Write an enzyme that holds these catalytic residues in place. Sequence first.
Site, PDB file in Angstrom:
ATOM      1  N   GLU A 197       0.799  -1.226   0.000  1.00 37.70           N
ATOM      2  CA  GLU A 197       0.000   0.000   0.000  1.00 37.70           C
ATOM      3  C   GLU A 197       0.831   1.275   0.000  1.00 37.70           C
ATOM      4  O   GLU A 197       1.811   1.292   0.738  1.00 37.70           O
ATOM      5  CB  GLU A 197      -0.895  -0.041   1.235  1.00 37.70           C
ATOM      6  CG  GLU A 197      -1.474   1.347   1.526  1.00 37.70           C
ATOM      7  CD  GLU A 197      -2.146   1.363   2.884  1.00 37.70           C
ATOM      8  OE1 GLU A 197      -1.971   0.390   3.647  1.00 37.70           O
ATOM      9  OE2 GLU A 197      -2.859   2.333   3.167  1.00 37.70           O
ATOM     10  N   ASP A 199       0.651   5.167   0.808  1.00 37.17           N
ATOM     11  CA  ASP A 199      -0.092   6.309   1.318  1.00 37.17           C
ATOM     12  C   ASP A 199       0.524   7.617   0.860  1.00 37.17           C
ATOM     13  O   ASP A 199       1.436   8.178   1.476  1.00 37.17           O
ATOM     14  CB  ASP A 199      -0.092   6.269   2.849  1.00 37.17           C
ATOM     15  CG  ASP A 199      -0.883   5.067   3.322  1.00 37.17           C
ATOM     16  OD1 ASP A 199      -1.919   4.846   2.694  1.00 37.17           O
ATOM     17  OD2 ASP A 199      -0.474   4.409   4.276  1.00 37.17           O
ATOM     18  N   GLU A 202      -2.025  11.433   3.907  1.00 36.44           N
ATOM     19  CA  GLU A 202      -2.874  11.149   5.095  1.00 36.44           C
ATOM     20  C   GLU A 202      -2.818  12.376   6.011  1.00 36.44           C
ATOM     21  O   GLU A 202      -1.746  12.657   6.549  1.00 36.44           O
ATOM     22  CB  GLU A 202      -2.556   9.891   5.877  1.00 36.44           C
ATOM     23  CG  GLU A 202      -3.137   8.620   5.179  1.00 36.44           C
ATOM     24  CD  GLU A 202      -2.913   7.487   6.152  1.00 36.44           C
ATOM     25  OE1 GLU A 202      -1.773   7.153   6.489  1.00 36.44           O
ATOM     26  OE2 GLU A 202      -3.902   6.935   6.624  1.00 36.44           O
ATOM     27  N   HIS A 213       3.987   1.482   2.202  1.00 34.02           N
ATOM     28  CA  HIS A 213       4.012   0.272   3.001  1.00 34.02           C
ATOM     29  C   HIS A 213       4.133  -0.953   2.077  1.00 34.02           C
ATOM     30  O   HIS A 213       3.147  -1.485   1.555  1.00 34.02           O
ATOM     31  CB  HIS A 213       2.793   0.081   3.870  1.00 34.02           C
ATOM     32  CG  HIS A 213       2.329   1.179   4.748  1.00 34.02           C
ATOM     33  ND1 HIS A 213       2.314   1.115   6.141  1.00 34.02           N
ATOM     34  CD2 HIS A 213       1.784   2.394   4.461  1.00 34.02           C
ATOM     35  CE1 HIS A 213       1.774   2.201   6.638  1.00 34.02           C
ATOM     36  NE2 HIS A 213       1.464   3.003   5.639  1.00 34.02           N
TER      37      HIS A 213
HETATM   38  O1  LIG Z   1     -10.519   1.052   9.512  1.00 36.00           O
HETATM   39  C1  LIG Z   1      -9.794   2.216   9.867  1.00 36.00           C
HETATM   40  C2  LIG Z   1      -9.641   3.163   8.710  1.00 36.00           C
HETATM   41  O2  LIG Z   1      -8.502   2.719   7.961  1.00 36.00           O
HETATM   42  C3  LIG Z   1      -8.184   3.514   6.789  1.00 36.00           C
HETATM   43  S1  LIG Z   1      -6.999   2.530   5.802  1.00 36.00           S
HETATM   44  C4  LIG Z   1      -5.331   3.098   6.283  1.00 36.00           C
HETATM   45  C5  LIG Z   1      -4.497   1.811   6.280  1.00 36.00           C
HETATM   46  O3  LIG Z   1      -5.030   0.842   7.107  1.00 36.00           O
HETATM   47  C6  LIG Z   1      -3.054   2.161   6.619  1.00 36.00           C
HETATM   48  O4  LIG Z   1      -2.184   1.276   5.991  1.00 36.00           O
HETATM   49  C7  LIG Z   1      -2.786   3.602   6.242  1.00 36.00           C
HETATM   50  S2  LIG Z   1      -3.297   4.417   7.837  1.00 36.00           S
HETATM   51  C8  LIG Z   1      -1.749   4.056   8.745  1.00 36.00           C
HETATM   52  C9  LIG Z   1      -0.638   4.902   8.083  1.00 36.00           C
HETATM   53  O5  LIG Z   1      -0.438   4.719   6.719  1.00 36.00           O
HETATM   54  C10 LIG Z   1       0.692   4.459   8.773  1.00 36.00           C
HETATM   55  O6  LIG Z   1       1.737   5.280   8.314  1.00 36.00           O
HETATM   56  C11 LIG Z   1       0.471   4.596  10.221  1.00 36.00           C
HETATM   57  S3  LIG Z   1       1.933   4.467  11.242  1.00 36.00           S
HETATM   58  O7  LIG Z   1      -0.576   3.782  10.722  1.00 36.00           O
HETATM   59  C12 LIG Z   1      -1.846   4.343  10.213  1.00 36.00           C
HETATM   60  C13 LIG Z   1      -2.977   3.745  10.964  1.00 36.00           C
HETATM   61  O8  LIG Z   1      -3.287   2.425  10.704  1.00 36.00           O
HETATM   62  O9  LIG Z   1      -3.518   4.235   5.205  1.00 36.00           O
HETATM   63  C14 LIG Z   1      -4.914   3.880   5.053  1.00 36.00           C
HETATM   64  C15 LIG Z   1      -5.652   5.141   4.819  1.00 36.00           C
HETATM   65  O10 LIG Z   1      -5.932   5.867   5.958  1.00 36.00           O
HETATM   66  C16 LIG Z   1      -9.350   3.672   5.858  1.00 36.00           C
HETATM   67  O11 LIG Z   1      -8.984   4.616   4.853  1.00 36.00           O
HETATM   68  C17 LIG Z   1     -10.563   4.149   6.612  1.00 36.00           C
HETATM   69  O12 LIG Z   1     -11.596   4.262   5.678  1.00 36.00           O
HETATM   70  C18 LIG Z   1     -10.848   3.231   7.795  1.00 36.00           C
HETATM   71  S4  LIG Z   1     -12.286   3.695   8.828  1.00 36.00           S
END
Ligand SMILES: OC[C@H]1O[C@@H](S[C@H]2[C@H](O)[C@@H](O)[C@H](S[C@H]3[C@H](O)[C@@H](O)[C@H](S)O[C@@H]3CO)O[C@@H]2CO)[C@H](O)[C@@H](O)[C@@H]1S
Length: 398
Positions: A197, A199, A202, A213
């Site tokens: 994945e 990101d 965010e 990731h």
């Molecule tokens: O269900 C919760 C919410 O999740 C996001 S998905 C989230 C992924 O799970 C994750 O890989 C990242 S958030 C992640 C950061 O990328 C990471 O750097 C840090 S240290 O940890 C955070 C938290 O887990 O990117 C996606 C996008 O946010 C969904 O988008 C939501 O819809 C749902 S509610």
Amino acid sequence: QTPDKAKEQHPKLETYRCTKASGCKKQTNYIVADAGIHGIRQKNGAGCGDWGQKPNATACPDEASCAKNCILSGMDSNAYKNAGITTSGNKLRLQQLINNQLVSPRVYLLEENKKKYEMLHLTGTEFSFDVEMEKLPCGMNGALYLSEMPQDGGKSTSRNSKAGAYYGAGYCDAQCYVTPFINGVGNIKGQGVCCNELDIWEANSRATHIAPHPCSKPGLYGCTGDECGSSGICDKAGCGWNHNRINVTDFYGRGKQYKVDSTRKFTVTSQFVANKQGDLIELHRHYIQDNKVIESAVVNISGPPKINFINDKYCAATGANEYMRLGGTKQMGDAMSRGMVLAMSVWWSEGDFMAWLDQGVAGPCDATEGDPKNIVKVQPNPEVTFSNIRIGEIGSTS
Ligand SMILES: OC[C@H]1O[C@@H](S[C@H]2[C@H](O)[C@@H](O)[C@H](S[C@H]3[C@H](O)[C@@H](O)[C@H](S)O[C@@H]3CO)O[C@@H]2CO)[C@H](O)[C@@H](O)[C@@H]1S
Ligand SMILES: *[C@@H]1O[C@H](CO)[C@@H](O)[C@H](O)[C@H]1NC(C)=O
Ligand SMILES: *[C@@H]1O[C@H](CO)[C@@H](O)[C@H](O)[C@H]1NC(C)=O
């Protein structure tokens, strides 16, 4: 689950493909709500399982039974609007709440035909969007990211997989969470649903984060036991870049005292640089506010190389162990080269309040204003508008 017969009216979104020589050309793309938001129910109105859990045991003793007993409701225009999803020209608006209902949308981009997800191959290319972050206080997360989800939603994996990309099926990400459905089919074994994945964005109006990731298995993978854990097949943490964590706290924030003013519109340009062999080696970021190119700022703490982009030296230096252990930037770029699905969401967290994004060294928030109960005091209707997405040759999108 098995889609019912209701009409699906996917909101239209215009996006652009660009070249230095021809500029950006408009494309018709569609937006689709996650399969979950569509409504997956049993005939007696019960649900077919909860996030983090396997599916209803009585409705889904096996895959076929699950396919028959769990029906997915089609979403028409008003369904989309009540889920918090709306589009206009090249703008996508995601609202967190509708009539005091938590809707927190997650949407994926479809090809013009609506049967496949628009797959994006970002290694060696550039991606840009415009964002409207003002209505996002501490604790909120307006996310623009990519997941290596099955283009067809998982449909080809099984005879029972029916939802497809057309209804939002096949989600995964680097967290490897146990969801009631994997590839459009009941997750009877209760596996974590994993996949590489990226990101790109965010954020809230007080802090932003970038984070690749990598995972050691290609495409969507149902992990079991330790495969799902910290030292498992995915890098749960990622190799992040938040200007506040590398000590440049005036780069992004609300107002005139920040280089990029989160209270106003701006362009976010990301550039995924490849070496001669075609491998991803570095991730670059730069912004555009008021017709001004705002370069990213160099690392301002001792340790990391003094650069303003992500590379393996930076990730290694910043304690991104799993990232490096599962293949670092080259591994992430291999998923990006194969093609990934554009995901966009709005969310908040009752469990840690997004502290990793906007508290302590990550930002300017305290330990409680991010609480969802406080977030609506500050901003009663948290929302975010992503728009003008344009993918193309490096140097031609922004
Ligand atoms: O269900 C919760 C919410 O999740 C996001 S998905 C989230 C992924 O799970 C994750 O890989 C990242 S958030 C992640 C950061 O990328 C990471 O750097 C840090 S240290 O940890 C955070 C938290 O887990 O990117 C996606 C996008 O946010 C969904 O988008 C939501 O819809 C749902 S509610
Ligand atoms: C499973 O669905 C049945 C009805 O088919 C329902 O009685 C039961 O509560 C469900 N289990 C859970 C945990 O919801
Ligand atoms: C953060 O940068 C400021 C100046 O820009 C400096 O005074 C401070 O010591 C830096 N912090 C660290 C840990 O380097």
